[PDB]
Each structure stands twice: as structure tokens, then as C-alpha cells.
Amino acid sequence: LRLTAEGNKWRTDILKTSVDTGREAAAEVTNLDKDTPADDPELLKRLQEILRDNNKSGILDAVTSSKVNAITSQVVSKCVPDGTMKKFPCNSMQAMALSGAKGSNVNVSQIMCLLGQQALEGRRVPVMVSGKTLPSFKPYETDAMAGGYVKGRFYSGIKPQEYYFHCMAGREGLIDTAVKTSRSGYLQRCLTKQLE
Amino acid sequence: SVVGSLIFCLDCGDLLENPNAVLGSNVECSQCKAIYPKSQFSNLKVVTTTADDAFPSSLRAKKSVVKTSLKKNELKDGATIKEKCPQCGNEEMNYHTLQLRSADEGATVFYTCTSCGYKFRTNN
Amino acid sequence: KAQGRTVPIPGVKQALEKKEGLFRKHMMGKRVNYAARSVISPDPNI
Amino acid sequence: FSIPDGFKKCKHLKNFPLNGDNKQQQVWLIKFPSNVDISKLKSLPVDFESSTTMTIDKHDYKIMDDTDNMTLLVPSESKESLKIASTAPLQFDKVFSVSETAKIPAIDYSKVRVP
Amino acid sequence: SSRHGQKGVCSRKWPTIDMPFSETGIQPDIIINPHAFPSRMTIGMFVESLAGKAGAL
Amino acid sequence: RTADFRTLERESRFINPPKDKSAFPLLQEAVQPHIGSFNALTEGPDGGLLNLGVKDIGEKVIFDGKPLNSEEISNSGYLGNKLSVSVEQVSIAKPMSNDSAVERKVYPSESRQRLTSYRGKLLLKLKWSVNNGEENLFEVRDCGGLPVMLQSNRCHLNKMSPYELVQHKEESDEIGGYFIVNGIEKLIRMLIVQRRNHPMAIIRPSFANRGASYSHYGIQIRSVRPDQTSQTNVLHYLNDGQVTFRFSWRKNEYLVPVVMILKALCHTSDREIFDGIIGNDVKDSFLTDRLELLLRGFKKRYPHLQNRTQVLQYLGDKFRVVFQASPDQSDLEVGQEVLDRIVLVHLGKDGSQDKFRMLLFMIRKLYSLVAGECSPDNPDATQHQEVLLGGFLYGMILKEKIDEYLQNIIAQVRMDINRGMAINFKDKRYMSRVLMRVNENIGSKMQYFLSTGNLVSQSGLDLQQVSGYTVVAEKINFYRFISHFRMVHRGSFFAQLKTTTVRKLLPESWGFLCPVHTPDGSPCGLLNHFAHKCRISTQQSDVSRIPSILYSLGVAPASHTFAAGPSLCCVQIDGKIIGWVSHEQGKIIADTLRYWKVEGKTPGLPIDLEIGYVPPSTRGQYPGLYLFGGHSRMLRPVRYLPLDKEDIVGPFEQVYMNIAVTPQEIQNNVHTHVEFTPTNILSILANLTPFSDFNQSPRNMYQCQMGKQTMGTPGVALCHRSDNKLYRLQTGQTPIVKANLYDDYGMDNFPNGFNAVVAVISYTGYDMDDAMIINKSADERGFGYGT
Amino acid sequence: SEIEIESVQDQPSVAVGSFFKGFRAPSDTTFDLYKKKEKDEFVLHGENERLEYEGYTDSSSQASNQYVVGLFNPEKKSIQLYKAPVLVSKVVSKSSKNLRGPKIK
Amino acid sequence: CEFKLELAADTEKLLMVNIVEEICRKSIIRQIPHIDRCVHPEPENGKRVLVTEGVNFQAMWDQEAFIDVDGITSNDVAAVLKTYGVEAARNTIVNEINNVFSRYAISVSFRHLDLIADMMTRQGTYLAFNRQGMETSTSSFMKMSYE
Amino acid sequence: MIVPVRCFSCGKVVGDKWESYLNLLQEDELDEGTALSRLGLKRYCCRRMILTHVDLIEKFLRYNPLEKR
Amino acid sequence: IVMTASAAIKTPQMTLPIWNDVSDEQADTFCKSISKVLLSEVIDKVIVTETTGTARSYVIHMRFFDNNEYSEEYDVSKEELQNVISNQFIHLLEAAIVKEIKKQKRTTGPDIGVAVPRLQNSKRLEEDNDE
Ligand SMILES: [Zn+2]
Ligand SMILES: [Zn+2]
Ligand SMILES: [Zn+2]
């Protein structure tokens, strides 16, 4: 599960560019030249317009997600496998994913690199009427972490804000398994009785 | 006092009736039989502009400061992984993880080939 | 097809259509002799 | 009417200087809390707009000023009780409101944010 | 099950002679298959393993 | 140097159960919303909820079929002799056993072994008033065995120290909160209900499909009486421009024009209604037309109703049958009786002026929602809800049963006067004869609710569901048992919906509802569990001293100001609109209040008070300074940055609050609070999970369900129990790897597992994905043995 | 800018009574003031040929707030202060004191 | 566009803006029957196509200068059957069922789909696997054991 | 309940070392680790056996239906 | 398909194969030519000046988007807009006002005292997945 000192250095350096990404995407959807500051009064008014509309928030979420996911893909492509301390065939975690015995390179990357952007029903993390994604974050915060982008991995651990956001996305799937009325029972029963 | 299309009594404050519904030359309040009108009240007008959100159109969306529509070509899914595509063989593939069936069951990975666009659902 | 008495006793039509029906529950499908049921356990030596 | 019980009619009412000439006359309305003593203060510091500062025995106050219904009743005579003020209904020239303001302490970040 | 949501049915009660024996001379009480962890991603159990050993010693 | 386990301390406490204050106060703090709720039923100010409830149900009138015989037109109008029956006081006794003469104390252990109920004698002072108190007859009537809650106000264990509990065959640190009914421990499940005394702007497609030209827009306020009984009032915006008042009496819905219910409360002009809703925003054409539709519509429909008395009489005449208030009660009395019992009951009687001001605010909020000025309030969100505690629910149904009890007395008298006529009401003999022909066993009726969970009521309370209010306090292991008293359900009605928004984990739940502890499958996101440091309000205090503090801080009185809208800040204390201020000053008051709140120098401002400030926004939530102090509120402790002291926060006020997680993450000029520990956001079972910040989200969730299904320790006082079935691990062991909160809840009293040598190995070939191997020689030595 | 005060009157003299937006009245009628004896509550009452005026002080506002009215000079820069109670006044008409049977059918 | 409306003295107050608003979103400038919107997606496997949110073949038949009338596909089986015949509807059934499976990356042999389609089109119509389609079956015992 | 006879993993008798362990923690005032070493428990399997023992029997015994009070 | 053989499909569609001689711009113009256009889609603002004199006078001003804007976004001309307002919209507006006058005079208000309609296995639904 460990990365080498060289491989872990790459991880911290690529994830260091992710801090700018949050505001960069927020400035792109809002349409503002020279990349305005994160605390800009016109930008904060512009982000509010986005908050009140389901479509406008969707454009903001899809742009920020694609940009942070590009940072994720970079971390994974660099660190795995050329940055892992123990390497295949000896790295059993890596071996099981490559052999097709159990698991995939996606699970391996969440363990050794980062969880990534926590996607909820196609979009990012839900946001309150106050413009806050959590009571810890600033209203209309232009940061990747605030949107649900988890820089942390399961090996090193995940921060409480990231933990709560992971809890959201984790449960989201189980909720869909509870609300799914569609069954193949009657569909097959109708065909078999007429085709027997 | 007179406000908009409404006309209120100066003594009690009860809303006075429309001068067209009752008899001509004189009008009176329902609470107290007060002496009205003065004829200086004039034919009132009320300007009512549209909810501006009342007409949602593709052009109205093109008018509203913030990006309301994404580009056809500029369409990106999730993060990319080094998993080979089973349709063509593209090393790059977009991924998305979810938890289906049970909390006992393993994590489900949803793949999307960046080359063709083949959707691939696999648990392990 | 009978008047309400102050759940009534089932008729012969009701007997043939109790739930899934006599045809589905006792003709198309049946409980069988010389059969057993148990929890399955893995084994690579068989 | 006569009701309610324990209420006595006001026979004696002090004189009010009302003229409204023209170098003109101004009528002011002020809101004050029950904690402060009006008879103690013989001078009130007030300036235009919302900006105001006042300190009466350790307690700090602020005099809110607003441009803009209430009806003023001035006594014409002690026997005539109270009547509605008029010149040509009457409105106040300037309206003020005293609000008790407390100084919230600045967060000692060097003491609270610890690595 | 461990305190990390890794439940499994008892497949067999393996004899100690047939059980793998450690350098110390200890044979495990419970055997968990390594193919359980890549899908579940229960790393809390992995750190619990080296913490529990350190605390026992 | 370490975060060690108490071994010497543990074993000493096992032998010596403390004779002083019990260890692990957090364990008693877990059952605090249960015991506290039942405690407030008799103890506390105003004589408890039960004495307040009988004070609210009032009298029940019946007239004798006897003439006046006076030497007249009075004879024909004479209804006969009046009989007004009510209940002054309500008494509850601790469980006792009489054998006819001298009474003996009966403890819970006895009730369990006997397979009977842990009941307390319910007494209630009946008032038999004749011809409006010309002769009054009082009788303290025994109304059966009311099941009493364990470790509560009326339980024999509440005073008992760990030593005394063991000597009385109970657990050393017995929690309580449950009821022993026919040998089965049953608890009243906590419910998520709309936050009390707050107007909620809601968009619902349900409102449209009910009537003709009905829109999605509407306002909903859940007004609660001091006896904890609720009465919801709904406002509807019709496409015609008409506003209607919706309410419920018995189990039927009723609609009345809002301009009618306004004019019934207090004498006002049409312009007083205009100034009350439309403030200085007189030029708003949208509002100018809608208000004209209301006022002209009322004048067209009801031209005869020209004064407050006529309106009350018209209201009394149409509701005289449903409200059953008859046959001597005037339409003015019945009219006022409708108002006092239905319209904004949270402000109560002798507060019609307060009810009028709050109603105008609801109309303005309704018009702000239609226009778009205000975003709709989310009912499914934690900010717009409170928690109906078991003890309060128990008190509500009790109030219902005593109302039924009085109705039955009248029913027996009505039977008597409609046949043999019998005798007069002044005779004690007749009263005693009626009373023993009436079913007075309220204890059995309350025992039924605790034995079935089925809600049998004439009003149906302000709840949607009718079943599953009670659940068996399953003691298969302590982890499952303690989680029962920290578990909260949205409602049985919500479980049968295609909507997923209800099940969705929201940021509003931070520190109140646990993000991990929720079941898998069907109860996912519905059957939640509270955070370990979360608390629920049992009552309110110093609430009457706060308006004096607000008025001094610059709040202009609502009775003199006459200006309303989202353009100005509205100050409210428990739904009581007290004044008006600017939005700039609105925050200044809200920040200065919190400062004097945490400071122990202010006597009139309590630390548990909720200061819900809502700043003005572009198409956001309706702004205002909505303060709260009342019961059922969700509360949690946080560290207030200035002064460095504890502050109590609610889910409503938190939405706009900036609370840092760790002190190192505090940002300047954008943070006012910090968390004590991030562990405060998780449940007891969620905190107990080792290195949960290293596990994948659904695995932490599955562990809560696992620890609940484990064969651990269900108790140590088993030799004095007689439960259906119990699972007991013989060789319990203390975890080497553990969260320190394991000791704080004294989980060592009930071990749930064992420390095993586990090797992550694929060797045997019989272990693969869902199958694991156990050592034979370990099993032979008693490893994991259970009974 | 410190403004000086000439005189303060703690005795009843001048009072203020809020009605509604657009109140005129005949401007020849009188208003009888009443007082009750910590904090004194005031009651206002007037009479007219077709109308009647009734006013009272808010119990929650009187004990917490103290209202004062003053006259300002443009040259002397001195204010003469006089305590004035705020009375929530309502106007009743000739149409009032109208009602039907206490019990109808 | 400005226009004045004159109403009677008895008509009194009315919310005209809300009345106008509702009629504007109800008023159609131009609409081709049964079709709501015509979009231009990315060329499917190299084929230049336009996806319509409605079905009317006879209207598209007039657009011969833009559309190849011999390749106009439609998901609606009944609509295809009504205009192009039973064999065309049969081909729509095998293609549409395949689209359902291909989206979820599930491969089902066309031999199965062809058999299912042929069974649905056995009567020259479009029969479904239910009580209605079954009515035309010889075995009363098979029918009795269905419902 | 009571101290188990023999270590679940190897089988080294542990039942005679429970009361002796508490005496090394109380009277001798030693740390958990050194106390287990003096008892002759070097394998971590034998180490956890006594170290991790709860001894709920002392809690269980306080309920005696054969003696008054 | 299989179970109901519906003639009324939820999402009925048509795939139109475009020629090679028809360009990407021409095809997008063609898409606009067939797509349903509503009056709402071309209107920017509506100003109603309700004035009561002599007769309720309603001055309805239709402020549309610029002529070149909607002609390039919906393929709709000013002539096309004239025909719809002068033939459809006014006839539809007149019918809506007449209906609103009748609805006002029909029911004067809701009935007071008369009850109106209400607004809105248990253990099986309370069972988790393992249960
Ligand atoms: Zn009048
Ligand atoms: Zn591919
Ligand atoms: Zn050992």
C-alpha cells in the first residue's frame, strides 16, 4: 500500500496545483477576465446567481469536476506504478488488480493516491441556501476541497470534511438500490409462457 | 389616501368601492357614510412588467453574464485510469465509483472509453 | 357474486384462484420427494 | 367608555411651544432604553447620518438617524386635553433612535490557532 | 467480522498441524483471504493489525 | 505517554459498584432526551405537561331535561341544569402493590420476573361544576396503572447509585428510558417533525391536486401549545389571487378566507391589513394587485361582516357542529373558541394582537415566494425540523385519553337523561353512579399504545402515521440496545415514497445527525442516529426577559413601526414577532446577543438559546432574526472563538455560521467558532469503529449494523431476567486497538468481541471473498464460544 | 457635535398616537388621556358624530422602551425634551355595535 | 407589438399579466404536427443524422432535399408498422431491443431477438407478451395456467 | 467470565496467572508489559490473553439469589 | 416493447439521415426550421398598463428580442410573428379573459364549515439488507 519517497513527492507536487483549480473553474463559468480574486465582490454576486439555478450550478459543477479529475488522472498516471515502493509481482495489491483475481487499478489509486472528486447524482457536493457546502467552509468558497474533491487517500487517511463528503457519495449508491421498482420477474414470465 | 388602483378612506381606512359599480356623481364608504368624490382623484393607471423568468427560452439563457450551456465538443466525464478498453483497446478510460446492492458487496466501477465511448460496468 | 354477510367462505372459483392459482401453485410447480436443502460451503478439493 | 379599572383622567397637562413660523421650527422624536436616566443627561451628542457615539456610565450607545404613519398629538390647552397637530396632519422633521451597542472582543488567533 | 465491516462465514475449522505456523511458533486464530481487501478498501483493518500486535508485545 | 486501558481501575469498579455519582456520565447523557421528556410530564415549572394538558381540554357541558316552572318566555329558553365536568390536577405514583390495605414498593426486576407491567397509579382530580359553579363536586379518581419509564421522575431507580442498583438486581450503570410492558421492554421511538413556531414557505405539487386553481406555493407553521400538543396552520395562494387558511379539527380539513380569520382576531381597518403586509414597498405592482383581490373579494363575498363581532358570529355559526361547542354557547363564544383552539396556538389566548402580526408576516412571506423574492424552505433539511421526544408524545396521547374520559362521562349522562331521567347533578350519589358506569382505565389504553405502537386518537395529533410509534428495546447486545435510544425516524409515511431527497445525507445534519450510522437497504437515510454530543431541548426559560434586551439593542416595536417585507429584518422570539430593524443592524444584534450569551454576567440570556439570523440575499431564504428557546430543539456544543468558552448551536442558525473543524484550520475574518473534537459529528457506534478515517464509506456504515448483530454481552443481571431470547459471549475481551470514547461509555461492562491472531493469507483454499477460516485448536480451547 | 438640552419634563403633557397610513380626521375633536399607578400605562379616547377613537400603550414596549419628543432651535441649538407615550390607536365606526342572535338554528 | 383591450365596468379587477404569461407559453408560432424538437447530435459511427423528438414520416417525406427518405429510422414500432409494414416493424423490434442491451454493454445473440420479433409479428400485427396477445393461442390449459 | 485455561493460539496455561498479574500491577506498581514478562508470557498471543482479559465474573457474582442483601 | 407493445411510447423519436451535399450550417438551420417555436421563446418583456376610465383599458406591450436575434436562433421572421398574434394569440387571450370572468361570478368563495379533502408490511419496510 506504500509509495516510495520519490513517488510520494510527485503526489504532493501535482496535488499542489489543485488549490488554484477551484477558483480557476469558478472564474471560467462566471465569465471574468485576468482571473479575478477568490474574495471579489462581483464574483461572489455572480456565484449566487449560479447557486439559485439548477442548470447554472450544473455548468459550474461539470467544469470544476472535469478540471479536478484531470489533476486526479495526472497523480494516478505518475505515481502508479512508477512511484510505488513495492512493485509487481511482489506488490500483491497491484498483482490482484492486474491478474483480475480481485479489484481494479481504480481501487488501487484510491488506496495509494487519492479518492478524487466525490460525485453526487452526476454533480458535486450539495450546497446550502447560505452558499456553504459545510459549516466549516466559507460561503461561496472557490476551492476544490469545498466542492468535494478529496486529496487524501485511504492509506494516509481522510480529513473530517472529506469524510462527511465521502459518506454522502457512499450512501448515494445504497439509496438508489432502495428506490428501484423495476423487476425482470414478470417480463421473463410473460415471454416463457408464450414461448415454452 | 389613494395607492395604485386602490382607494382608501381618510377617516376609517376601509377600502372604497369602484365608482363604476355604484351610482354616478357621488360615492360613499361602507363603514361610515362619508362625502366623496372630489373628481380630482383622476383615472388611475398601474404599470405591471413581466416575472422575467416567466419566458424561459434558449435566447434568454444566452442573455444571462454566467455560462448557461456547455460546449458540444468540450464534454469530459470523470478521472482517467490506465485500464484497457475491451472494444478497441484504448489504454485511457474515464471512471466513476458507486456502492450498489449491499454495504457487504464490493465497490462497483463504471468505465467510459475516451476513444469510442463504450460504457463498461464491472465489480471485479 | 354472492350478497354480503355481516371475509366470506371461498367458492370453487376462489379455490382454483386462491393466490397464484391451483394451476400455478400445484400443477406447473410442485413440492417434490427425494430432495434436500442446505447452506452451500466452498470446496476446491472436489 | 369609562373602562378600564384603576385609570384616572389627566386634568393637568404642561404647555408645549408650538408655532411653526416661516429661521424655521423643527420637531424631533427620540427613542431611549429604560436602563438610561434622561434627567441625568443635560447634553446629547448627535451628528447627521447613522454615524454616532455616546458613553453614559460605562454603557455605550449609538443614535440611529433615519429620514423616513405616526400622528403627533399636541395639547392646545390643559382643559382641551389633546388635539391633532396641523399647519395647512403633521410629520416629524428629524427622527432618531438610541440603540445600546456592545464591543465584541477580537479573537486572540496567536492563542487559539495552534499547529 | 472485524470492526471494519469485513464479515465472512466459517468455511472450515482448520487443524493447527495443517494451519500455517509463524517463526514465533504461533498459528493464526482466524484466517482472512487477501482477495477481500482490494474491493472493500478496509485499510483501517490493516493499520489495526500492526497496532494490535505492537500493543500486545 | 500512551492512551492505555484501565485494568486496575476496571476490576476495582467491578467488585465495588460506586455509592456516589455513577461513572460514565455520557451513558446517562445518551438517554437524557428520553428520561428528561418523561420527567417534564409532572416535574418542572407550571406543574408539568399533564397539568397543562387538562387545563387546555377545559370543561364538557350537558344540560338536564327539566323545566324552570317559573311564573314566561324564560321557560322555553331554559336548557335545564348545567353540568360542566373537567380535570384540575393529574397525579402519577411510583410502582406499588397493595394486599387491599398496606402498600409495598415493586421494583423493575420484579415486573420482569413476574412477566407483568411496571405500572404506576394514575390519579386525576375530577371537577363536577353545576350551573356555572353554584355547587362544585371534587373526586380524586383512580384511572388504572399507567406504565412508568425506567430511571425517570416516577421510577424507584432514579435516586439509586451503582451500588444500590446492583442490590436491586439491576445493571451497575442502568440507563433506563424504556417501559416494562407484559415482561417486554418497549421504547417510544423519536420522530423528526417540523420546527415549532416558524412560517415555512413551501412549494408542493400536492397543494394543487386538492382544490380548484390551487398553486404549488404555500406557507406552513407548526404551532405548539405549552402542553406540547401541536396544531398546524397552512396558507394557500390561489391562481385567482385569493389566500385561504387551511386547518384540521377531528380528522377533517377546513378552509376559510385569510381576510376573515384576520378580522376575527382584533378590530382593524382594510388599510391596517395593507400596512401590515405591504411596508414602505407600496410601489410594488405585484403586491398592489394581489392585496386588492383579497380586500375586494372579502367585501364582495361578505358585505354584511362590518365588525369583529359579526365575523366571530359568522365563524361560530358555521363551526358550532364540528367544534361541538353547544347548546348555551353563543356564536361569539364558539367563534372565539375556534380562534383560541386553531389559529396560531403557539401565541395562545390573550395574544390575538400577536396572532394578527404573525398572520400578516405569513401573507408577505407567501407573496415573496410566488414572486420569487424568497427561495422555498426545505422541510426534509435538518435546519427546518425538531425532534418529537417519546415522553412528550406519551403526554399528548394521555391528554387525548382524558379528553375522551370526560366525553364518556357526558355520554353516560346523555344516556341517563334520554331514558329513565334518574336524578339531579347536585346529588353525590348520582355522580358516583355515573362515574362507575364509565370506563376509567386510562392505564390500559396507555399500556396498549406501548404494546402495539398504534395511535388511537380523535384528532390524530399533528402526525401523518398511525402505527409503529413503539418498538421493542432489543437487548441482543449492549451496542444495539444503546443505539435504540439515539435512533430517530423521519416517519413511517416517508418510507413509502419514490423521493430520494428525504434519504439524502445533507450538510445541515453536521454534528446533529451521524453521517455513518444508517442501515443498509430499505431504512437507508430514514432510520438515522444522532451524534454522541448532540442534545435535545426538554423545556425553555428566561425567554420573557429577552424582548427587554432586544428593545434596548435597538429593536423598534412591531405595534408602532408598521412596515413589513424582505427589505427589512423581522425579530421573533419562539414565533412571537416583537419588532422590526434594518438588515445591517440585524446582524449587529445577532452577534452582540451571542457575546452576552456565553458570558455568565447576563442573567436574562440563557446559553441554550438559538439565535437564528438570516442575512438578506438575491432570491435566497426569507431574512429575519428568528430566535428560539423552546422544547424538542436539536443542540450541540462548540468552542466560541472570543472568550474561548462553550456555545450551544442549533441546525437552523448553523447554516449561516462559520465553524472550523480543527483549531489549525481557523481562517481570519471568516470564522466565528471551532469544534471541540471532530468526533462530535459521529454516533457512539461510529466513534467506536477503529481508524474509520482509513476505511471506505460503506464499510464504516456496515460495521454499525454488524456491532448491532454481534453475540456480545446483553447484561450481567441475567439471573433475574426472563427475556424471549438472549445471546451471550462467554470469553469477552478488551480491545488493544480502541477509540478512547470506548471507556467514556464504559463499554468494558459489555464486551462485544475478542482479540484474535489474524493472518491475511490465502493458504487453505476454503477461504475466498465471503468465506473465512477458524483454527480448530482455538475453537477446542473455547475461542468465540457463546450460549 | 454635542447638542445641549434646556429642559426635561417627567410629567404628562404631549403624547403620540399611531393610527394608519393616510389619517386625516375632522381636526376639531379632543382626545382624553388616562394614567395608571414601576411603569405607568396610558389610555387614549376620543369621540365624533360618526366615528370613535380608542388607543392604549403596549405592555411589552412600555417597560423596555422610553419615548421622548423635543423641539429644536436653528440658532440657539437647544432642545426642550418632554416624555411622550406611544399609543396604538384604532378607530371604530357607526356601523359597529351590530350583531345577530347568539344562537342561529 | 402594442394592442389595447377594452372591458366592461362590471368586469372590475383582473390579473392580466398572469393571464397573458400563460397564453404566451401556450401560443405556438410554428410547429410541425407530432414533432416537438429537432436536434443535431455527433455523427453516430460516421453516419450524418438528425434526431427528432416526435414521429411524422409524411412530413419528413417533403424534406427530400435534406433527408434520405429511404433511411429514415424511428424507435416507435407501431408508427413504423402503420406506414412501412410488418417486416419493417419486425426489424425495428430487433434493433430497439438490441439498443437496450448494447447500452448496458450486454451482448445477446440476434437469433434470440429475431425469434422474439417473429413471435410478436406472427399475426401480421404487433402483439405483446400478455393476456391480449395470448388470446390467439390453441391451448386453453396453457391459458388457464397463465391467469 | 473467568480467566481462560490455556492460550487460544498455542495452548500455554494462562488461568493461574490472572490474580498474580493484578498483584504485580497493585503491590509491585509495575507497568502492563513488564508484569506479563515476569509471569512468563513472551509470545504476543499469550501476552494479549491476560492483558486483554475483562473478568466479568466479578460483576456477575454481585447478583446472588442464595444470600439476602 | 415486449410486455405492452405500446403505440404511445414515452420518448418517440425519428433518425433522419442527412445527405453529403447538405452542410453542418444548413443542417442546423433545418433543425431550427422543424423545431417547435413558442411565442414565449421570442418575448423579452410584457408591460400591462391597467387604467380604468369612462371601461377597463388594458395596454399590453410585447417587447420581443431583437429581430436578427430570434431569426438566427429560431428561424422565425417578423411576418411569421405578425400572423400568430393577429390570428391565434388574441383569440386565445379573449377566450381566457371570458373564462376568468365566468369563474369569478360562478363561485364567490369556499364553503365554510363544510369539510374539504385532506392534503395526504411496516416491519418489512423497517428491515435492513441483512434482515
Ligand atoms: Zn369611512
Ligand atoms: Zn474503446
Ligand atoms: Zn499463546
UniProtKB/Swiss-Prot annotation, chain B:
It holds the Pfam family Zn_ribbon_TFIIS. Component of the RNA polymerase I (Pol I) complex consisting of 14 subunits: RPA135, RPA190, RPC40, RPA14, RPB5, RPO26, RPA43, RPB8, RPA12, RPB10, RPC19, RPC10, RPA49 and RPA34. The complex is composed of a horseshoe-shaped core containing ten subunits (RPA135, RPA190, RPB5, RPO26, RPB8, RPB10, RPC10, RPA12, RPC19 and RPC40) where RPA135 and RPA190 form the DNA-binding cleft. Outside of the core, RPA14 and RPA43 form the stalk that mediates interactions with transcription initiation factors and newly synthesized RNA. Interacts with RPA2/RPA135. Zn(2+) 1 binds at residues 9, 12, 29, 32. Belongs to the archaeal RpoM/eukaryotic RPA12/RPB9/RPC11 RNA polymerase family. InterPro entries: DNA-dir_RNA_pol-M_15_CS, Rpa12/Rpb9/Rpc10/TFS, Zn_ribbon_RPA12_C, Zn_ribbon_RPB9, Znf_TFIIS. Residues 78-124 are annotated as: Required for RNA cleavage, but not essential for elongation activity. It is found in: Nucleus, Nucleolus. A zinc finger (TFIIS-type) spans 81-121. A zinc finger (C4-type) spans 9-32. Residues 1-59 are annotated as: Interaction with RPA2. GO terms for biological process: negative regulation of transcription by RNA polymerase II; nucleolar large rRNA transcription by RNA polymerase I; ribosome biogenesis; termination of RNA polymerase I transcription; transcription by RNA polymerase I; transcription elongation by RNA polymerase I; transcription initiation at RNA polymerase I promoter. Residues 1-68 are annotated as: Necessary and sufficient for recruitment into Pol I. PROSITE patterns: RNA_POL_M_15KD, ZF_TFIIS_1, ZF_TFIIS_2. PANTHER family: DNA-DIRECTED RNA POLYMERASE (PTHR11239), DNA-DIRECTED RNA POLYMERASE I SUBUNIT RPA12 (PTHR11239:SF14). The keyword Cytoplasm does not apply.
Curated annotation (Swiss-Prot), chain F:
Its EC number is 2.7.7.6. It is found in: Nucleus, Nucleolus. The modification Phosphoserine is found at residue 70. One of its GO terms (cellular component) is nucleus. It comes from the Eukaryota. Keywords: Acetylation, DNA-directed RNA polymerase, Metal-binding, Nucleotidyltransferase, Nucleus, Phosphoprotein, Ribosome biogenesis, Transcription, Transferase, Zinc, Zinc-finger. Its main location: nucleus. GO terms for biological process: nucleolar large rRNA transcription by RNA polymerase I; ribosome biogenesis; termination of RNA polymerase I transcription; transcription by RNA polymerase I; transcription elongation by RNA polymerase I; transcription initiation at RNA polymerase I promoter. GO terms for molecular function: DNA binding; DNA-directed RNA polymerase activity; ribonucleoside binding; zinc ion binding. It catalyses: RNA(n) + a ribonucleoside 5'-triphosphate = RNA(n+1) + diphosphate. It is an enzyme of class 2 (transferase). Belongs to the RNA polymerase beta chain family. Three distinct zinc-containing RNA polymerases are found in eukaryotic nuclei: polymerase I for the ribosomal RNA precursor, polymerase II for the mRNA precursor, and polymerase III for 5S and tRNA genes. This is DNA-directed RNA polymerase I subunit RPA135. The gene is RPA135. The chain holds residues 12 to 802 of 1203 of the full protein.
From Swiss-Prot, chain H:
It comes from the Eukaryota. It is found in: Nucleus, Nucleolus. Belongs to the RNA polymerase beta' chain family. Component of the RNA polymerase I (Pol I) complex consisting of 14 subunits: RPA135, RPA190, RPC40, RPA14, RPB5, RPO26, RPA43, RPB8, RPA12, RPB10, RPC19, RPC10, RPA49 and RPA34. The complex is composed of a horseshoe-shaped core containing ten subunits (RPA135, RPA190, RPB5, RPO26, RPB8, RPB10, RPC10, RPA12, RPC19 and RPC40) where RPA135 and RPA190 form the DNA-binding cleft. Outside of the core, RPA14 and RPA43 form the stalk that mediates interactions with transcription initiation factors and newly synthesized RNA. Present with 2840 molecules/cell in log phase SD medium. DNA-dependent RNA polymerases catalyze the transcription of DNA into RNA using the four ribonucleoside triphosphates as substrates. Component of RNA polymerase I (Pol I) which synthesizes ribosomal RNA precursors. Besides, RNA polymerase I has intrinsic RNA cleavage activity. RPA190 and RPA135 both contribute to the polymerase catalytic activity and together form the Pol I active center. In addition, subunit RPA12 contributes a catalytic zinc ribbon that is required for RNA cleavage by Pol I. This is DNA-directed RNA polymerase I subunit RPA190. It comes from Saccharomyces cerevisiae (strain ATCC 204508 / S288c).
UniProtKB/Swiss-Prot annotation, chain I:
GO terms for cellular component: nucleoplasm; nucleus; RNA polymerase I complex; RNA polymerase II, core complex; RNA polymerase III complex. It comes from the Eukaryota. The keyword Cell inner membrane does not apply. Zn(2+) binds at residues 7, 10, 45-46. Component of the RNA polymerase I (Pol I), RNA polymerase II (Pol II) and RNA polymerase III (Pol III) complexes. Component of the RNA polymerase I (Pol I) complex consisting of 14 subunits: RPA135, RPA190, RPC40, RPA14, RPB5, RPO26, RPA43, RPB8, RPA12, RPB10, RPC19, RPC10, RPA49 and RPA34. The complex is composed of a horseshoe-shaped core containing ten subunits (RPA135, RPA190, RPB5, RPO26, RPB8, RPB10, RPC10, RPA12, RPC19 and RPC40) where RPA135 and RPA190 form the DNA-binding cleft. Belongs to the archaeal Rpo10/eukaryotic RPB10 RNA polymerase subunit family. This is DNA-directed RNA polymerases I, II, and III subunit RPABC5.
